[PDB]
Amino acid sequence: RPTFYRQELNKTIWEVPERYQNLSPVGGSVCAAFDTKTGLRVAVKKLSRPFQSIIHAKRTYRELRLLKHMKHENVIGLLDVFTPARSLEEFNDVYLVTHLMGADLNNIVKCQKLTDDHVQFLIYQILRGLKYIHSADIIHRDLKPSNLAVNEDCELKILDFTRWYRAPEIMLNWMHYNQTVDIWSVGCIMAELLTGRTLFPGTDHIDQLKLILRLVGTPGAELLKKISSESARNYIQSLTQMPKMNFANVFIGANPLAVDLLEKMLVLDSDKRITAAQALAHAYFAQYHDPDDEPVADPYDQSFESRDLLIDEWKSLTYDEVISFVPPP
Numbered sequence: 001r002p003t004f005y006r007q008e009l010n011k012t013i014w015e016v017p018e019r020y021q022n023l024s025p026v027g028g029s030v031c032a033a034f035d036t037k038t039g040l041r042v043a044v045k046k047l048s049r050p051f052q053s054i055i056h057a058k059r060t061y062r063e064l065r066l067l068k069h070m071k072h073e074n075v076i077g078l079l080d081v082f083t084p085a086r087s088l089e090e091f092n093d094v095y096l097v098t099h100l101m102g103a104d105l106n107n108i109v110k111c112q113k114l115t116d117d118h119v120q121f122l123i124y125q126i127l128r129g130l131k132y133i134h135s136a137d138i139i140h141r142d143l144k145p146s147n148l149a150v151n152e153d154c155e156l157k158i159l160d161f162t163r164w165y166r167a168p169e170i171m172l173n174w175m176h177y178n179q180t181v182d183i184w185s186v187g188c189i190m191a192e193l194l195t196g197r198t199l200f201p202g203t204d205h206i207d208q209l210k211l212i213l214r215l216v217g218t219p220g221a222e223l224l225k226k227i228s229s230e231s232a233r234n235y236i237q238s239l240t241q242m243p244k245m246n247f248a249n250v251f252i253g254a255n256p257l258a259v260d261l262l263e264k265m266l267v268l269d270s271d272k273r274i275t276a277a278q279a280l281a282h283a284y285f286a287q288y289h290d291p292d293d294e295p296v297a298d299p300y301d302q303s304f305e306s307r308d309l310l311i312d313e314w315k316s317l318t319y320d321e322v323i324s325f326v327p328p329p
């Protein structure tokens, strides 16, 4: 058990292994810090109201279990996790420590116009991390430029687990989402890397859906066939019957292989969207693809997801997970 010290940043207290120094707010609350032990800049995150309700307590546990399991180059991982509390009885606060990646993809696209080679590599690393996430049977569900950290070498990590990058079926609360909701996201992000502009900058919920329909067109008979509801099913007919656009004509001048990949991500029907593993074999990534260096995750026990427990059950399990934590090499 290390030594802790106390300090107030903005309007909140932090107690941290003394090895963590120069705490400075960045936006639970987050602080950048220097890891005196390893010599590297870190992010330390203090979980808001970890055990306030049953839902929060389950979310805390989910969050830790998830991040504990993420061991991949293109996915954020845990350097450390600590509480100031000795014993479960005292246990009330949880801190997570990860790499301070010092620029995100939004920051990169605003300033620099990226080449074809840049977008192959960036999207390639997204799909690579994504293949690993999906192979644990997890859906990210919030991929966007600000959830993607990028260094000087234009190397990328997925952060996470606005609506411009959200699959239309989440916006319609369709339920049982499949993993290709993240693929939709990747398609929006890639369109934006290619053009420098947000593909679907909706002002609100319906606007979002409006701009989507103008690009990819109103649902095809094959898709309408799958819409359980007389409800949803009409209104659609009643809409200005839009043509699916030619992506060739929208992303004019882009690599035609990139344009083909985009048609395969930005399909309305989630059943027809390319998967992360299939996209990695797409000819667009021929320069970067290596079928032996695109690993999948260990099996992720998420049976907890289906259980309804008492707050103290959730916290104790969270405590076990703090105690069980082994740092990476």
Ligand SMILES: CCCCCCCCO[C@@H]1O[C@H](CO)[C@@H](O)[C@H](O)[C@H]1O
Residues within 6 Å of the ligand: 168, 169, 172, 174, 175, 176, 177, 178, 209, 219, 223, 226, 268, 269, 270, 271
């Ligand atoms: C905005 C107009 C309608 C949007 C159509 C979105 C269709 C998304 O695709 C749907 O994904 C579901 C998973 O949610 C699958 O069960 C369906 O089989 C599939 O068609």
